[PDB]
Design a protein around this ligand. Sequence first.
Ligand SMILES: Nc1nc(OCC2CCCCC2)c2nc[nH]c2n1
Length: 290
Amino acid sequence: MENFQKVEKIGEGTYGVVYKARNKLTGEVVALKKIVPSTAIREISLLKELNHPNIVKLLDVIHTENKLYLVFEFLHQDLKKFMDASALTGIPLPLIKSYLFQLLQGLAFCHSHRVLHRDLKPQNLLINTEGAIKLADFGLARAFGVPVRTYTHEVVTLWYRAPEILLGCKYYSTAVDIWSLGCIFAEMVTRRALFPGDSEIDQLFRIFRTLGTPDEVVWPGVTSMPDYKPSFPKWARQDFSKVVPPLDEDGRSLLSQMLHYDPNKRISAKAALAHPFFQDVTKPVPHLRL
Ligand SMILES: Nc1nc(OCC2CCCCC2)c2nc[nH]c2n1
């Protein structure tokens, strides 16, 4: 670590404090994440080759003193902050579309190498001043788990968790990332989290209250998920026109496919990139004060 000068604390991530740091011998300004089991080291080393322009570059993995430090490319803002800052007029649609579109490319890339994020959230989606948006912390969940509370006891958000994870499916797939990104897409659009659950049950019930309590018709096998209970209330599905109003039909079409209950029906990242929603996609520059 002596090769890094901490510039400022950027935040408290899932696994440890995130610092803006400067690499003393490269001159590079990086994001330094203090997170070691051999399994975690080999997984993490696999992440170093997962390179894609909508994936926050993993510059180096420093394994010293028993201590694990990941050095990432530094972006200048996360999507939560950018949404919070854009709350008054919201993020212009063409920008939403461009981020969604680039996030899907980032997903398609990782998913094609069988790597899931598992923990997508606005805070791990980082934007630059040019209009790019990238996924940070890809593959970390599989390397070190997703805790209930972070190392600061901060509560890990459930707002973006796929229903098959809430239902205790142990073996969930790349569909959980599409679900999360669908939730983030809706939040960009409406400027309100779609499902801000504050407990697993509240999260699940929130889902059900909007999309209908899932049953065997829409999701074969749902009733035999580990945490499914026959006693769950049976809520009717709400129309998507009421759920993300502003959004045009191609947007709502795509979001309902990203939000399919059955993970096998849920649109893949690559099919989502061929959705007519992206027909006029462009790459606008965000209004970004740094
Ligand atoms: N500019 C910035 N921020 C990060 O994390 C912000 C996350 C830190 C967790 C608190 C939410 C903010 C980065 N990660 C890799 N590059 C990064 N660049």
